[PDB]
């Protein structure tokens, strides 16, 4: 499962977490099995405008 | 207030919609000890002290 968020919301990508992303965007199960990988993409996804 | 003179505010006789707080991503740290934030909307407290 691939997507993009902001750094403050990286914590929300985990079982049993709350917030905008977890509640309304992407929710992991409490018994989730698997790995979560996240890395900065400022050089790629940011624009001057 | 300064940490050495941290301010204490008493909260009482009001409805506390904590969702507005824990939903907003602005907060970088949100950690509840002895409580789960989801249950905050379904709970009542006696001496609330910010």
Curated annotation (Swiss-Prot), chain B:
Protein's job: Attaches the virion to the cell membrane by interacting with host receptor, initiating the infection. The major receptor is host ACE2. When S2/S2' has been cleaved, binding to the receptor triggers direct fusion at the cell membrane. When S2/S2' has not been cleaved, binding to the receptor results in internalization of the virus by endocytosis using host TFRC and GRM2 and leading to fusion of the virion membrane with the host endosomal membrane. Alternatively, may use NRP1/NRP2 and integrin as entry receptors.
Reported impact of residue 24 to L: In strain: Omicron/BA.1
High-level lineage: Viruses, Riboviria, Orthornavirae, Pisuviricota, Pisoniviricetes
Impact noted for substituting residue 29 to A: In strain: Omicron/BA.2, Omicron/BA.2.12.1, Omicron/BA.4, Omicron/BA.5, Omicron/BQ.1.1, Omicron/XBB.1.5, Omicron/EG.5.1
Organism: Severe acute respiratory syndrome coronavirus 2 (2019-nCoV)
Protein's recorded name: Spike protein S1
Effect after changing residue 26 to P: In strain: Omicron/BA.1, Omicron/BA.2, Omicron/BA.2.12.1, Omicron/BA.2.75, Omicron/BA.4, Omicron/BA.5, Omicron/BQ.1.1, Omicron/XBB.1.5, Omicron/EG.5.1
Effect of residue 24 to F: In strain: Omicron/BA.2, Omicron/BA.2.12.1, Omicron/BA.2.75, Omicron/BA.4, Omicron/BA.5, Omicron/BQ.1.1, Omicron/XBB.1.5, Omicron/EG.5.1
Gene coding for it: S
Subunit details: Binds to host ACE2. RBD also interacts with the N-linked glycan on 'Asn-90' of ACE2. Cleavage of S generates a polybasic C-terminal sequence on S1 that binds to host Neuropilin-1 (NRP1) and Neuropilin-2 (NRP2) receptors. Interacts with host integrin alpha-5/beta-1 (ITGA5:ITGB1) and with ACE2 in complex with integrin alpha-5/beta-1 (ITGA5:ITGB1). May interact via cytoplasmic c-terminus with M protein. May interact (via N-terminus) with host bilirubin and biliverdin, thereby preventing antibody binding to the SARS-CoV-2 spike NTD via an allosteric mechanism.
Portion of the full-length sequence here: 348 to 397 of 1273
């Amino acid at each position: 499962d691939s997507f993009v968020i902001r750094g403050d919301e990286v914590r929300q990508i985990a079982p049993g977490q709350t917030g905008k992303i977890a509640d309304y965007n992407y929710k992991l199960p409490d018994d989730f099995t698997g790995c979560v990988i996240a890395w900065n993409s400022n050089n790629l996804d940011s624009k001057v405008g | 207030a300064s940490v050495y003179a941290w301010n204490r505010k008493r909260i009482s006789n009001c409805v506390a919609d904590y969702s507005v707080l824990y939903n907003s991503a602005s907060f970088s740290t949100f950690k509840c000890y002895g409580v789960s934030p989801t249950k905050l909307n379904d709970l009542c407290f006696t001496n609330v002290y910010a």
